[PDB]
Amino acid sequence: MKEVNVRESSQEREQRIQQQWQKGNVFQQSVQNREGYPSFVFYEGPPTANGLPHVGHALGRTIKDVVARYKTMTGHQVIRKAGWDTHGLPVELGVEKQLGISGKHDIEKYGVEAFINKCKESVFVYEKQWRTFTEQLGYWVDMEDPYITLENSYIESVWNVLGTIHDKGLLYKGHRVSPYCPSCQTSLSSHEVAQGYKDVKDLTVTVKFKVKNRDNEYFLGWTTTPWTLPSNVALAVHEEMSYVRAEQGDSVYIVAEALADKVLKGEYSVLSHHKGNELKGMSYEPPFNFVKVEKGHEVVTADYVTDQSGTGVVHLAPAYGEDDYRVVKENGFSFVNVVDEKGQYTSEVPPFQGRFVKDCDVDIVRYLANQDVLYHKEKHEHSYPFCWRCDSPLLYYANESWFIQTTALKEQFLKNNESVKWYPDHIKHGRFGKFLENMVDWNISRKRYWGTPLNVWECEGCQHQVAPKSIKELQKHASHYVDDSIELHKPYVDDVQLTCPVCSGEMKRTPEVIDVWFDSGSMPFAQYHYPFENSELFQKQFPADVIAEGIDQTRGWFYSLMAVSTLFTGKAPYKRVLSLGHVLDENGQKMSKSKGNALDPVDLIHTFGADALRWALLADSAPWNPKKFSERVVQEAKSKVIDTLVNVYGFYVLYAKLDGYDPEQTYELKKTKLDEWILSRLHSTVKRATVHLEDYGFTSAAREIAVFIEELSNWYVRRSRDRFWSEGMDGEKAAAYDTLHEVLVTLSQLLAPFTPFVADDVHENLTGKSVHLADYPACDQTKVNEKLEKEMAAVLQVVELGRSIRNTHSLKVKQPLQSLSLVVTEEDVEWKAYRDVIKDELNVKNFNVEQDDDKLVSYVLKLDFKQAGPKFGKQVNEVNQALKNLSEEKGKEFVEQGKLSVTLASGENLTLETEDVLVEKVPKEGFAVASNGMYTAVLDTALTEELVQEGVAREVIRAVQDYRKKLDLPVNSRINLELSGDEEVQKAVAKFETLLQENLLLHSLSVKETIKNGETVKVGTKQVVLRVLNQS
Ligand SMILES: CC[C@H](C)[C@H](N)C(=O)NS(=O)(=O)NC[C@H]1O[C@@H](n2cnc3c(N)ncnc32)[C@H](O)[C@@H]1O
Ligand SMILES: [Zn+2]
Ligand SMILES: [Zn+2]
């Protein structure tokens, strides 16, 4: 083993370990060495290369590393291939800002290829930043040969999946009302929409729709979206609902019967009743006539019309509502649209053309009043969908899109999810399962530029569709030569046309790219270029035994993985999911670069070490709920846990070298009880840490290890230092080194998944072998001693109570005290075995175990004025004083009898009730008490001259020992000590001459009045002059 003497920062140690890992190919070796062992299949969720990693990203990569390292150590091969997510809106928008452009028209002007090249350059920059962060965090994952979603082979596998889905009839094009982002100018999927809901307040209005062929009669139409009123095509009523013609003032209003009293306020008179199907076909005047409707402006039956809210007459705009689209289509009414692709009014609405529709709500209300059609308005507090990338409010907008028909396999989705073990369990049928139950088809087409091109070609002539699964299939169908090096991106694939197998017409590729979530969802198949390559490796690497990503992937990678695999293979792509709560700042606020509360994990790693950051991320709280985090928690992990291990390790190395201990040599071992206890704690920790890790309880396993590390340092090492400090390799010293060597090797093995850097530094130096090539240690039950653990835990509690008393009464432990008495209710612990430990640790001359406190306490008596006030009147203070004057035995009698008589000054005898007296139990004179209920410790705090003088002699002994170290004197030489001090020091040194001589290797001791050029030292509150000569 090598020394740990030269001061090394945490960063320097981890850099040294990192280089050791590189030179030895330890990561690669930890995989290859498990060839033929059972597989544990792990999929890396690919980080989006559109920004810098923050400390929240360190949680998931820490947990994935713990799992992979642990499963490797317990006898599994864990292949770890990194991945980078590089397509889609999350990349495009950031690049647009870098370029100072915005929107699809600006991208066309900039140039599609030039824009895409900028995207490629940006993702490459971010990949390197993420790679460096991952390496310094110690998350072993192959970033030399990662999968990358922009790579041609990866895209080809995605094409093969999409082509296979198309073969089944599950990829189709349709004109549907879909959630739509007016800024990004594209439809969005249902999982993307679920990620962007925000509470808003807007206006729902009731508008009068004047009935044609009548007078003073208006329908009361209702809508939550005033901006859709110019596009009105029909009014919807329920067929079997009852409506009333109600007269108010000079007008008559048609409204639902159950809502009339709410809608019509002040005064009305119901004239007639009508069913919903009776009102069918009645024409009316639209609130706006800017747009011309060919067929419409009538009343139709819709089954979804409710009488619970609104008026029972619902304004329908077919282009901006799925129900509205369906009902208008059924009744053959003309479809109309008044909005461009940017969410702005077209020329068909003159007064508002070129304005965002949701910003016209206030002006629409005023226009409604001016036409005298407005009848009511109210505020609507509800959730509304916003774009998960650009924060623009969404619209529901009729649009031609491509869909993956996920609903066709909904039953298979639920069955696959039912096979998955979720952490936390509630996600399975909660956040994730509920999303499966409300499944709609997956809108995958994005009218964008940077992404996986949707590989569907349509014949211009007969609309036949061809979906090439590969470059070879693309080449086979193309009407022109297609080079083998064709890049599977826009615009290169848009220059490829096919010959239609049906009519020989020209086939053109649909222009869209696909949802970025499909790319990552395809990684089980695309990361190995399946089925074109690595068919056998893929089969061994499917399904995954676990994945671990943030909770937002329930609307992300968790869903897209499940959907792609279910549509493609029918099978669940994973057996087990760790759904991780998000890291927040120290205030509980979400982490963001804009908010400035996103800590840099690289700075934390540089300052405190990755081992400390990882430990704090694992041990401070559980990973399943939102997590408050701070630099302070990392600092505490470094000083309390990481530094403590390093110091114990450095202590062992220094004294093992000095004493020439050799773990390969065989010694006669005199194992002590403290050796047995720490070994029992070691293997009990091994057992309980393994049990938690087997159930992915990282926090509980970490906390268990931290407890053991505290016991190892604060108790085992601290109390065993003499056996390392002593000279000569006796049986006890050899046992100490043997015990500590086993603890350090096994503990570092335990810690290897958690704190990989320091664990290897200890283990490799002690054994010559990397800890990460080792097996996870097994619990040796023969070294577990449950009784010994139980007693030492009781001893620690007693020592803690004793220290508490000493601190409370300002009695420093260096000052010996006469006795500690322990009151125990039961003879559970063999206290005789720990007498020397308790007396040493508390510095008491005597340790006595008592069954009760009768010899240690007394009773004083007072009067309960709230209970005995009226009974004695003006004599209450005389009786209360009478109780306080009673002797110790009188109080002892009262607590046993419960009845008491007090004789007042006049001789008047009075009787005291049990509840009239307040009883106080006090320790006997000179004693002090602390109790935890189970144990009552009674300490004699009374000081004698002999006790004080012994304390002075102890202080003299320590002062001399400190002065010897300052002079670099040999530990073997005997010294001539000269000492000067006042009479109290002189008397103490004289009286305890034997004690001084036993603890100091003194050739002679001279007490002088004055010392020439002496060293003044501070012994207690006194100053003592020392001077050391050497025997000549
Ligand atoms: C599995 C990854 C997806 C396919 C996608 N590329 C993506 O979300 N990429 S990411 O880089 O934005 N996310 C990386 C991982 O970090 C999690 N995460 C993101 N933000 C936080 C946060 N504040 N606290 C904790 N974890 C967080 C993501 O869920 C993902 O696991
Ligand atoms: Zn958007
Ligand atoms: Zn054709």
Author numbering: 1 to 1032
What does the paper say about this structure?
To understand how IleRS2, but not IleRS1, accommodates the non-canonical motif, we used X-ray crystallography to determine the structures of a pair of IleRS enzymes from the same organism. Additionally, the structure of the C-terminal tRNA anticodon binding domain, which differs among the two IleRS types, is resolved for a type 2 protein. However, superimposing the HUP catalytic cores of IleRS1 (residues 50–174 and 523–635) and IleRS2 (residues 40–168 and 513–632) unraveled conformational rearrangements within the signature motifs in the active sites. Relative to IleRS1, the KMSKS loop assumed a more closed conformation in IleRS2, as indicated by a 5.0 Å displacement of the first Lys backbone towards helix α1. While the KMSKS loop is known to be flexible and to change its conformation during the reaction, we also found that the HXGH motif in IleRS2 is displaced towards the KMSKS loop. The latter affects repositioning of the first and the fourth histidine of the HXGH motif by 2.3 and 2.4 Å, respectively, and the Gly α-carbon by 1.7 Å relative to the analogous positions in IleRS1 (insets). The displacement (shift) of the HIGH motif in IleRS2 is of utmost importance for the accommodation of the non-canonical A/GXHH motif and emergence of hyper-resistance.
Mupirocin, a clinically used natural antibiotic, inhibits isoleucyl-tRNA synthetase (IleRS), an enzyme that links isoleucine to its tRNAIle for protein synthesis.
